Amino acid sequence: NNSIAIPTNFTISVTTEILPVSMTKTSVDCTMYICGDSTECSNLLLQYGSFCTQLNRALTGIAVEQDKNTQEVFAQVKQIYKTPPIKDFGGFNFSQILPDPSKPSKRSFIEDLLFNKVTFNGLTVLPPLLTDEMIAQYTSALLAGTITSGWTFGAGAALQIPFAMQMAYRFNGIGVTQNVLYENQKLIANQFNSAIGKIQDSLSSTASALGKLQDVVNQNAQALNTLVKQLSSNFGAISSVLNDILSRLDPPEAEVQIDRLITGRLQSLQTYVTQQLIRAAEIRASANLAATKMSECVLGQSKRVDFCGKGYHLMSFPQSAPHGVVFLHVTYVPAQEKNFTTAPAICHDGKAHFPREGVFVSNGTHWFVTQRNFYEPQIITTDNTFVSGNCDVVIGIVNNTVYDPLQPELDS
Amino acid sequence: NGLTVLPPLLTDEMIAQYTSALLAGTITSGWTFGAGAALQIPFAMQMAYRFNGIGVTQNVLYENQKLIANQFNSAIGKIQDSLSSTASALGKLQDVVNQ
Amino acid sequence: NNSIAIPTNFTISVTTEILPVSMTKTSVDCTMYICGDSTECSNLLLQYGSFCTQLNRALTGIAVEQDKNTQEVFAQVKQIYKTPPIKDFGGFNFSQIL
Amino acid sequence: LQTYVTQQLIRAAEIRASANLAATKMSECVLGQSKRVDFCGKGYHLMSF
Amino acid sequence: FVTQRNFYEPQIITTDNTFVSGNCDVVIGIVNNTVYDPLQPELDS
Amino acid sequence: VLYQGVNCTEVNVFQTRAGCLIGAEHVNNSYECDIPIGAGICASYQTSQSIIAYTMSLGVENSVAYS
Ligand SMILES: *[C@@H]1O[C@H](CO)[C@@H](O)[C@H](O)[C@H]1NC(C)=O
Ligand SMILES: *[C@@H]1O[C@H](CO)[C@@H](O)[C@H](O)[C@H]1NC(C)=O
Ligand SMILES: *[C@@H]1O[C@H](CO)[C@@H](O)[C@H](O)[C@H]1NC(C)=O
Ligand SMILES: *[C@@H]1O[C@H](CO)[C@@H](O)[C@H](O)[C@H]1NC(C)=O
Ligand SMILES: *[C@@H]1O[C@H](CO)[C@@H](O)[C@H](O)[C@H]1NC(C)=O
Ligand SMILES: *[C@@H]1O[C@H](CO)[C@@H](O)[C@H](O)[C@H]1NC(C)=O
Ligand SMILES: *[C@@H]1O[C@H](CO)[C@@H](O)[C@H](O)[C@H]1NC(C)=O
Numbered sequence A: 001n002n003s004i005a006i007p008t009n010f011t012i013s014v015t016t017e018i019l020p021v022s023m024t025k026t027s028v029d030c031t032m033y034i035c036g037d038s039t040e041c042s043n044l045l046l047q048y049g050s051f052c053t054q055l056n057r058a059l060t061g062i063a064v065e066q067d068k069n070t071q072e073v074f075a076q077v078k079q080i081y082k083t084p085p086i087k088d089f090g091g092f093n094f095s096q097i098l099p100d101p102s103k104p105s106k107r108s109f110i111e112d113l114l115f116n117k118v119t120f121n122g123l124t125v126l127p128p129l130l131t132d133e134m135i136a137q138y139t140s141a142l143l144a145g146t147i148t149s150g151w152t153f154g155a156g157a158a159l160q161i162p163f164a165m166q167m168a169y170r171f172n173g174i175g176v177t178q179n180v181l182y183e184n185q186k187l188i189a190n191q192f193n194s195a196i197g198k199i200q201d202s203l204s205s206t207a208s209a210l211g212k213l214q215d216v217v218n219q220n221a222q223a224l225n226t227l228v229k230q231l232s233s234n235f236g237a238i239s240s241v242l243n244d245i246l247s248r249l250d251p252p253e254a255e256v257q258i259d260r261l262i263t264g265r266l267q268s269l270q271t272y273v274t275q276q277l278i279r280a281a282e283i284r285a286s287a288n289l290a291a292t293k294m295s296e297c298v299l300g301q302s303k304r305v306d307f308c309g310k311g312y313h314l315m316s317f318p319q320s321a322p323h324g325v326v327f328l329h330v331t332y333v334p335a336q337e338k339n340f341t342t343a344p345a346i347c348h349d350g351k352a353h354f355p356r357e358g359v360f361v362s363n364g365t366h367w368f369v370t371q372r373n374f375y376e377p378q379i380i381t382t383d384n385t386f387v388s389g390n391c392d393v394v395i396g397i398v399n400n401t402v403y404d405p406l407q408p409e410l411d412s
Numbered sequence B: 001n002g003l004t005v006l007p008p009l010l011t012d013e014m015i016a017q018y019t020s021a022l023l024a025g026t027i028t029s030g031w032t033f034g035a036g037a038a039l040q041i042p043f044a045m046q047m048a049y050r051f052n053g054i055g056v057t058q059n060v061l062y063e064n065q066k067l068i069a070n071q072f073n074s075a076i077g078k079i080q081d082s083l084s085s086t087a088s089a090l091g092k093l094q095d096v097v098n099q
Numbered sequence C: 001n002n003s004i005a006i007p008t009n010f011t012i013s014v015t016t017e018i019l020p021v022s023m024t025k026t027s028v029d030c031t032m033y034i035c036g037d038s039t040e041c042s043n044l045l046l047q048y049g050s051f052c053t054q055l056n057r058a059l060t061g062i063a064v065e066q067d068k069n070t071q072e073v074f075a076q077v078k079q080i081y082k083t084p085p086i087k088d089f090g091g092f093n094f095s096q097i098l
Numbered sequence D: 001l002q003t004y005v006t007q008q009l010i011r012a013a014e015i016r017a018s019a020n021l022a023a024t025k026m027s028e029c030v031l032g033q034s035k036r037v038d039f040c041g042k043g044y045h046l047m048s049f
Numbered sequence E: 001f002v003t004q005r006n007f008y009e010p011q012i013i014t015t016d017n018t019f020v021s022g023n024c025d026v027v028i029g030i031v032n033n034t035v036y037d038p039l040q041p042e043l044d045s
Numbered sequence F: 001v002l003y004q005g006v007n008c009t010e011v012n013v014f015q016t017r018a019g020c021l022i023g024a025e026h027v028n029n030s031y032e033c034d035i036p037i038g039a040g041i042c043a044s045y046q047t048s049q050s051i052i053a054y055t056m057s058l059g060v061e062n063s064v065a066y067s
């Protein structure tokens, strides 16, 4: 009831979070899938009505939504911001994640690692509206805004600010007094630069780290491979092949065999489209989450504990990836605590003093006030504290003597 | 009829270990176990920090601590009596079994 | 344009909120539901191709996700913190919930 | 069986939305202090168990 | 001058607009400049 | 008319990455996405009038004046 542990040191940390944003846009010619363009089957398929048209309408809804997702995630920026020639961001690295001029598509080094580690029977695949090169310009724009101008490019035009002062801001946003940055700038820059360096090794070590993106690539290949394999199925018909039936059984009997192949192939196609509608809803839930983390973690700083990497959130950098996005969340983690005696308030002369910000502690021999998230003791004073009533009502108050910095000047 | 129900990976005892751990962290160490190790802090001070987070000055807790403790203990008493008295509160879970 | 109301007192309140997290993990052998025991019918089902595997795969995906949901909700804590033996919690009583 | 599995995929997607909401409330309301009005029941939020 | 960060409003730099933390040696890019003392008019009463 | 995924050999005429595009005029200069096509191409009715097709501009470029 009188013990508090305060962190005397901390670590900047960089946590890599990976999110799917879009599926491979797909549209299927249901007549070329079912009938193979062989007219005797098409003249049966016409008798089923809207089961021809509405599957292309449903897959067109899915295909357009992949562009809408990718637009909402990356195109949050009002202008294509680009980085100055000078790179003196207070020592903080910014090279492995900014564009590389040697890369043909102007991707960053870490974007190239991600683009390496992730890997027609009436079916058609459609291109994305934004190419990988265009997405790599948006992830450069969001990054060059974030480096040169803080959160301000999310509120209006980008307002430049020196990068050490933007970090001083972002420390001041997590209840650490900004002097803790400036007094440690070289150490904080080294912890950050080292933490970026470990991302390249981490992403190099195993493809199993990118499981969320490798999954959305695998499941669409697995669905289409199964949709193609279902052409090789009888559904009660004499043969799995249409022009074979039309050569053997005479038109009267042929029709009953073909109507099974139509029913079976169509039920397989409705099963595939239904599964893609559900998978597209799961990917949209991920794309809305990614569109939220662009707004809150990149374009801002978030108070939401464990929404934006573990520890207190400082900032994040987006990097593009095949069918998705990767955030490098930068977080402050407190790391080397000591135990201290503490009391909720102190007594001066007949008055209870409470700390204005921070908390009271003692090393066992002296009483100090410290900020809550980093041990930095200050002598307890009439500006560091405020009074609220007599020396009784509080439970566990201690006796002390508060220094009043005006009284030595009133010696004049 | 070829239908089967599989066991969960975490048993209800293991869920009770995790809710115990989350709760004992939350009582002894505030939000700090959501970042670092669980830094101990006295619970009356953890409530003073949480009051300071809603624009109410820390002294409003300590000047009312014995009152605030009785309001909290009474409120938990009403939850325990309410959940004891009627099953009607758990609709959001019972509906998932029924469906 | 010149009136404000300010609270002179408070209540602490406790509000229960309830969220479901897992379905009952359920799985079906599609051959045993559709046919059941008959080798004749089981051979006839092969004419329908992939549906038997595809439906058991979809139920396996749902069934595996229930363990993931439960860990994503509760397994947020790195260590099993233990409540102390002495309850000096400034009068706040947590017996009913510890 | 196709009807049952299709409806269980949709129901399981609704339970995933609820499990992500519960993981979000676990992360913000327990491990922190929400400043998001009426995300944590009525009133200003203090903590949750 | 010092300003609030979201609207240009210059305040004269004073010991109550600002807080001390140690020497200059470690602060990269610090400048010099007077900081005014609001007590000074009554320090010279 | 866009022939999705075709080479013009198989069909003004313009080869895009999306397909052989017919009746539109290729323009090198870049503009907003007025009508989407695919693989960064977009089309519009900018003026004396015909449909044009061009690589879309993602926004006005701006080098922020940081020091
Ligand atoms: C704090 O921790 C870092 C490692 O994260 C270490 O290099 C440094 O010496 C420690 N102490 C100081 C000076 O803050
Ligand atoms: C970032 O670190 C890399 C390490 O290889 C170095 O080559 C690069 O010049 C550094 N960039 C800056 C501007 O700090
Ligand atoms: C604080 O107290 C605990 C228990 O006595 C002890 O294990 C720990 O080493 C002490 N120091 C720290 C790390 O705060
Ligand atoms: C803490 O509890 C012990 C119980 O014996 C008591 O003696 C002590 O005075 C209490 N201290 C505070 C700070 O309330
Ligand atoms: C503080 O000193 C007063 C006498 O001036 C005494 O009555 C009171 O018990 C003391 N309290 C503590 C915490 O020692
Ligand atoms: C405030 O309300 C509580 C009941 O919620 C009551 O016990 C207490 O006496 C009240 N205090 C004032 C200042 O009226
Ligand atoms: C807490 O509640 C339990 C059950 O009512 C009771 O037995 C125990 O004495 C209470 N403890 C305190 C601190 O009031």
Ligand SMILES: *[C@@H]1O[C@H](CO)[C@@H](O)[C@H](O)[C@H]1NC(C)=O
Binding pocket: A088, E028, E029
């Ligand atoms: C900024 O960089 C330039 C060139 O290295 C240097 O001359 C100047 O002193 C630096 N100013 C600050 C504030 O560090």
Ligand SMILES: *[C@@H]1O[C@H](CO)[C@@H](O)[C@H](O)[C@H]1NC(C)=O
Binding pocket: E030, E031, E032
């Ligand atoms: C401030 O003045 C001192 C001499 O009193 C000088 O040594 C120091 O370099 C000056 N600093 C700046 C940044 O002008």
Ligand SMILES: *[C@@H]1O[C@H](CO)[C@@H](O)[C@H](O)[C@H]1NC(C)=O
Binding pocket: F006, F007, F008, F009, F015
């Ligand atoms: C299309 O056909 C021409 C034939 O000369 C060939 O050169 C070209 O590479 C082909 N590919 C496309 C899509 O332009």
Ligand SMILES: *[C@@H]1O[C@H](CO)[C@@H](O)[C@H](O)[C@H]1NC(C)=O
Binding pocket: F026, F027, F028, F029
């Ligand atoms: C685009 O540039 C090429 C360069 O070879 C040129 O031949 C062509 O006429 C240009 N088209 C337009 C519309 O300017």
